[PDB]
Write a protein that holds these residues in place. Structure first.
Motif, PDB file in Angstrom:
ATOM      1  N   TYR A 103      81.591  45.761  78.212  1.00 45.06           N
ATOM      2  CA  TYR A 103      80.889  47.030  78.386  1.00 45.06           C
ATOM      3  C   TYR A 103      80.918  47.568  79.819  1.00 45.06           C
ATOM      4  N   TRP A 146      83.364  46.149  71.956  1.00 49.53           N
ATOM      5  CA  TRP A 146      82.154  45.421  72.077  1.00 49.53           C
ATOM      6  C   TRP A 146      82.280  44.081  71.436  1.00 49.53           C
ATOM      7  N   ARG A 202      78.584  50.439  85.218  1.00 47.01           N
ATOM      8  CA  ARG A 202      77.513  50.138  84.261  1.00 47.01           C
ATOM      9  C   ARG A 202      76.845  48.785  84.512  1.00 47.01           C
ATOM     10  N   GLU A 233      85.398  51.612  77.902  1.00 42.58           N
ATOM     11  CA  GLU A 233      85.145  50.188  77.833  1.00 42.58           C
ATOM     12  C   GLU A 233      86.158  49.547  76.875  1.00 42.58           C
ATOM     13  N   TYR A 275      74.014  53.805  72.367  1.00 49.13           N
ATOM     14  CA  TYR A 275      75.447  53.866  72.650  1.00 49.13           C
ATOM     15  C   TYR A 275      76.219  54.193  71.386  1.00 49.13           C
ATOM     16  N   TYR A 302      81.753  57.173  78.907  1.00 50.48           N
ATOM     17  CA  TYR A 302      82.326  56.011  79.579  1.00 50.48           C
ATOM     18  C   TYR A 302      83.476  55.404  78.776  1.00 50.48           C
TER      19      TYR A 302
END
Ligand SMILES: O[C@@H]1[C@@H](O)[C@H](O[C@@H]2CO[C@@H](O)[C@H](O)[C@H]2O)OC[C@H]1O
Ligand SMILES: O[C@@H]1[C@@H](O)[C@H](O)OC[C@H]1O
Ligand SMILES: [Ca+2]
Length: 161
Positions: free
Chosen positions: A46, A137, A18, A134, A97, A132
């Motif tokens: 991310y 955040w 990403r 991650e 997202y 995805y």
């Protein structure tokens, strides 16, 4: 299965980074298996492995997404998230997202992240839907090393409901 990735063939396929991070199919590490997808050189929360899945799916349906994740350096525990990146009307400058699931992993232990997701309808103009992984955040200035640890994914699966 509508989609499955076990990495046992050693192929990266359509998996992508990403940002500036590195993806690699490794051997000798996997969930009950010898291969998995390692993401390293992460410098943002991310950063993580991403794959486009909309072509595998019917618009306006509900599907079940799961994958297994593991990390083996840094903190004793760490949260990993499964997220969706969505594109509408082929506008690459206006992505959205959403986190679909989250679990706390223990260093060295494989664990499953899973949830039902909704594939938006045709009439939304949805043109991309990428899954995805991650870490939770938060922004560039607040990012720490525990946030950006390398991690592995494996046994990625999407099923009809
Ligand atoms: O969890 C989501 C984050 O992954 C998302 O981060 C964006 C990912 O794509 C990059 O091109 C952007 O710079 C970065 O902000 O932000 C929203 C959040 O829900
Ligand atoms: O919904 C938001 C998502 O798009 C990002 O991460 C933060 C969430 O609040
Ligand atoms: Ca595997």
């Amino acid at each position: 299965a509508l989609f499955k990735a076990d990495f046992e063939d050693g192929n990266i396929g359509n998996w992508r980074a990403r940002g500036t991070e590195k993806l690699e199919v490794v051997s000798g590490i996997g969930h009950n298996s010898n291969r998995s997808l390692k993401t390293s050189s992460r410098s943002e929360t991310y950063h993580g492995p991403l794959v486009e899945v909309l072509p595998y799916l019917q618009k306006g349906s509900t599907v079940h997404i799961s994958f297994w994740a593991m990390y083996d350096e840094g903190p004793a525990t760490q949260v990993i998230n499964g997220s969706l990146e969505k594109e509408f009307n082929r506008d690459t400058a206006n992505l959205e997202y959403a986190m679909f699931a989250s679990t706390t992993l223990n260093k060295g232990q494989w664990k499953k992240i899973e949830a039902d997701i909704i594939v938006p309808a045709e009439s939304t103009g949805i043109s991309g839907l990428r899954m995805y992984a991650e870490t939770p955040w938060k922004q560039s200035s607040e990012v720490t090393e525990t946030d950006t640890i390398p991690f592995y994914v494996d046994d990625v699966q999407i099923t009809a409901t």
